[model samples]
Target: NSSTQSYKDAMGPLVRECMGSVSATEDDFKTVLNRNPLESRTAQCLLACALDKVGLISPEGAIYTGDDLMPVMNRLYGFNDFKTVMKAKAVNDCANQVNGAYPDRCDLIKNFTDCVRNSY
Candidate 1:
């Protein structure tokens, strides 16, 4: 996993775009990660929460990979009601890409700007 600062640096722009102005401080996500400074899942979760807080996601929706909204939903809420799950999954199937699943997960982030465009 990347360092906290690294994850923040990687994700800053997406957060900015999602909130339309970036409200998630490094400290905000750090706190969510228990201040461990080495927790990537916390970063992922907080990023999701942050995105969901904004209107970028449907209620109960989450965001992963910073900019992509639906994969996070699939990973976190797939087992819930089919209607709700399908609502999230439907958008996910359309918004999430499968082009880059190779060496590094970060490399997958390369497609996020495109994902954001398609998402909204």
Candidate 2:
């Protein structure tokens, strides 16, 4: 199935609001998708900011799951059921297995990122 246009469309807010406050170029987000080390704290912050902006991550630096999360994922991965389920599993699993701490958000984000990368 074709991925809904919503992926990049949703990224509009992800990039726009975060770029305003977090100071990374658009390409840096692709870096995260590629699972490379981000350029620096700011770039990572941009990502964290974006995800948290969308409720994928919590204010306390934890990944979001449970009831409300699935609704959010639909907008992101609506075209494919396997993807929606797969994403929920990855994020929920990562949310459970990893350490999601504050001050160093990547303590949660890094392992979670890697977790999702390798999981499915």
Candidate 3:
């Protein structure tokens, strides 16, 4: 529970750092969820920044390996709950799909963002 609490405590500053001055809200995320991230680079970058902070995407904009994802999952789920594990698997699959579709770093952010939007 301490780890979870620590993660919760850390998230505030992490979010502030990740989000910058964009001021994108939950509505913005939801809008992007319903539409293509390409429609708004600001929204896409905001989401991408949050994902990168969570260790889902690398600073280089590539998806991290499964091993890299485990700690993030642990922090989020706290235990190996079925739904969380399945969600993590789906995210990894989405990452792989994006990786396969666009191997170049330039397109990884856009493709990965779109893959995540669709995967959910």
Candidate 4:
């Protein structure tokens, strides 16, 4: 938990640059539901970019595979158990569905956000 906190602290500057403010409350993230991705391309991209930076998403804009995420997941979640593997598979499947449906980067960003919001 302390490590997670430290990681967040270290990411503050990058988060601020992408989010316009790093001190966003849980409520602020919740408000993403009210925003239109198409009309707010920058916001969508910012969220996606932040996710990518954190290794939640890959450089290629896809969800990281379980193998790719095992190190972080083991460190952060404390073990790469069956549940973690399943979760990663589910996330990748969701991402793959979005990618398959939306070839355009903007559309992918929108759907990816939507998928995360709905799934998580």
Error of 1 at 112 (Å): 6.0
Per-residue lDDT tens digits for candidate 3, residues 1-120, read 112344444344555575565566665554433434544656666556655666676665678768887887775565646754676777678777776466544356677656655665
Q: Model 1 segments beyond 4 Å from truth?
A: 1-39, 60-120
For this target, which candidate reaches the highest TM-score against the unseen true structure? 2
Which lDDT tens digits does candidate 4 get at residues 2-69? 12343354344444565653344444333332333324655555555555555666666666654776
RMSD from true fold, candidate 1: 13.7
Q: After superposition, how far is residue 83 of candidate 1 from its true place, in Å?
A: 36
Off by over 4 Å in 4: 1-13, 19-39, 72-86
TM for candidate 1 is 0.26
Per-residue CA lDDT of candidate 1, range 1-120, in tens? Answer: 222343345445455454433344565455433323323433444555444543445443322333354454444344455654455544454335533342333233223323433443
Clash pairs detected, candidate 2 = none
RMSD for all candidates, in order, please: 13.7, 3.7, 6.2, 6.4
The alpha-carbon deviation from the true structure for residue 115 of candidate 3, after best TM-score superposition, in angstroms, is 3.3
Error of 1 at 77 (Å): 28
lDDT of 1 at 48: 54
- TM-scores vs. true structure, each candidate: 0.26, 0.73, 0.59, 0.51
Better of 2 and 3 by lDDT: 2
List ranges where model 3 is wrong by over 4 Å: 1-13, 21-39, 100-110, 113-120
- Looking at model 4, the pairs that clash are none
